[PDB]
UniProtKB/Swiss-Prot annotation:
Subunit structure: Binds constitutively to TP53BP1. Binds CDC27, which is itself a component of the anaphase promoting complex (APC). Binds PIAS1.
Similarity field: Belongs to the DNA repair metallo-beta-lactamase (DRMBL) family.
Disulphide bonds in the chain: none
Induction remarks: During mitosis. The mRNA encoding this protein contains an internal ribosome entry site (IRES) in its 5'-UTR. This 5'-UTR generally suppresses translation while specifically promoting expression during mitosis, when cap-dependent translation may be impaired.
Domain of life, source organism: Eukaryota
Tissues expressing the protein: Expressed in brain, heart, kidney, liver, pancreas, placenta and skeletal muscle.
Residues of the full protein shown: 700 to 1040 of 1040
Organism, as annotated: Homo sapiens (Human)
Subcellular location: Nucleus
Protein name, entry field: DNA cross-link repair 1A protein
Name of the gene: DCLRE1A
Function as written in the Swiss-Prot or TrEMBL entry: May be required for DNA interstrand cross-link repair. Also required for checkpoint mediated cell cycle arrest in early prophase in response to mitotic spindle poisons. Possesses beta-lactamase activity, catalyzing the hydrolysis of penicillin G and nitrocefin. Exhibits no activity towards other beta-lactam antibiotic classes including cephalosporins (cefotaxime) and carbapenems (imipenem).
Length: 341
């Protein structure tokens, strides 16, 4: 059964609610982004209207085979009427195709659902500038002050400089980057661009990338692994055994691997600056964990919420324990007392 924080009162709508069967009263199912915890339940047999971005619609059609007649793509930054209710989709600064949804309820209430997001000051000049929000359904993944990490630009600067140094010292080194979902594509794209290479990958991953509307993608990626010195592999293979096994397959073209594991936050963020990060090394294999986040830091989140000044907040992440729920409610009250709303 569908939980309360996935329902939008006063409408026939749900958000990210595909794993509960037929939801009573639902006339349109919204999908914020193509991550498995959110799409869990969709397939070619789904027969209700799905509302989403163009990019999410490309992924639903090609990767999950949802039939075309049930896919409803909406443009961003544009007022749209869905089943008699005005909605807007906004870029969430998460993975490709990810949106926040603004719902203008028939009684005058305005609701923002963030989906998964990485808050940014640029959001303070979207269509959110223009009006009040009564209810915020908030991505609270990192809602505690211990969660710190650098900007995505600092993290990419570190990766490009690390890869370019290593391959200039050794032209026979291969670079490998782990992946397990869409998102974080700048990691492997920026490294391949500095090296003058296409990115090599499996047919399955190439298919996924081809749904993303990335400009000039045909110039950047390939399934011909032999022509490429940046390879993508499943995240589960980014370990000494998996990488050893991979280097055997490369026909004596390479004599070293440098690998990157993009993660979210890890506790080593509580001690070590990005500049000071070192790899784990065994023999001719080195592995860097790099903290490339597609979710708000605590400070980014707080800034956004103090600017928006919502009347009520409903968290959408970390809702399963009393301790998590209590901690989050405490911070919402500080923020409100500090800013005066
Ligand atoms: Ni996500």
């Amino acid at each position: 059964t569908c939980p309360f924080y996935k329902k939008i009162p006063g409408t026939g709508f749900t958000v990210d609610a595909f794993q509960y069967g037929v939801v009573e009263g639902c006339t349109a199912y919204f999908l914020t982004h193509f991550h498995s915890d959110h799409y869990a339940g969709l397939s070619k047999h789904f027969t209700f209207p799905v509302y989403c971005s163009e990019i999410t619609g490309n992924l639903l059609k090609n990767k999950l085979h949802v039939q075309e007649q049930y896919i409803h793509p909406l443009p961003l930054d544009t007022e749209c009427i869905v089943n008699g209710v005005k909605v807007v989709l906004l870029d969430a600064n998460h993975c490709p195709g990810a949106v926040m949804i603004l719902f203008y309820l028939p009684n005058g209430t305005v609701i923002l659902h963030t989906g998964d997001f990485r808050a940014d000051p640029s959001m303070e000049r979207s269509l959110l500038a223009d009006q009040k929000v009564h209810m915020l359904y908030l991505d609270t993944t990192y809602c505690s002050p211990e969660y710190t990490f650098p900007s995505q630009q600092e993290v990419i600067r570190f990766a490009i400089n690390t890869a370019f140094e290593a391959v200039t010292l050794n032209p026979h080194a291969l670079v490998v980057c782990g992946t397990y979902s869409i998102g974080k594509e700048k990691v492997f794209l920026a490294i391949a661009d500095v090296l003058g290479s296409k990115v090599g990958m499996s047919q399955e991953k190439y298919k996924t990338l081809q749904c993303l509307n990335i400009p000039e993608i045909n110039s950047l990626i390939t399934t011909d692994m032999c022509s490429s010195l940046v390879h993508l592999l499943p995240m589960m293979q980014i370990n000494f055994k998996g990488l050893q096994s991979h280097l055997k397959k490369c026909g004596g073209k390479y004599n070293q691997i440098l690998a990157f594991r993009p993660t979210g936050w890890t506790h080593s963020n509580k001690f070590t600056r990005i500049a000071d990060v070192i790899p784990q090394t065994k023999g001719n294999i080195s592995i860097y964990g790099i903290p490339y986040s597609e979710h708000s830091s605590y400070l980014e989140m707080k800034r956004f919420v103090q600017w928006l000044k919502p009347q009520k907040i409903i968290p959408t992440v970390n809702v399963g324990t009393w301790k998590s729920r209590s901690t989050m409610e405490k911070y919402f009250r500080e923020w409100k007392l500090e800013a005066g709303y």
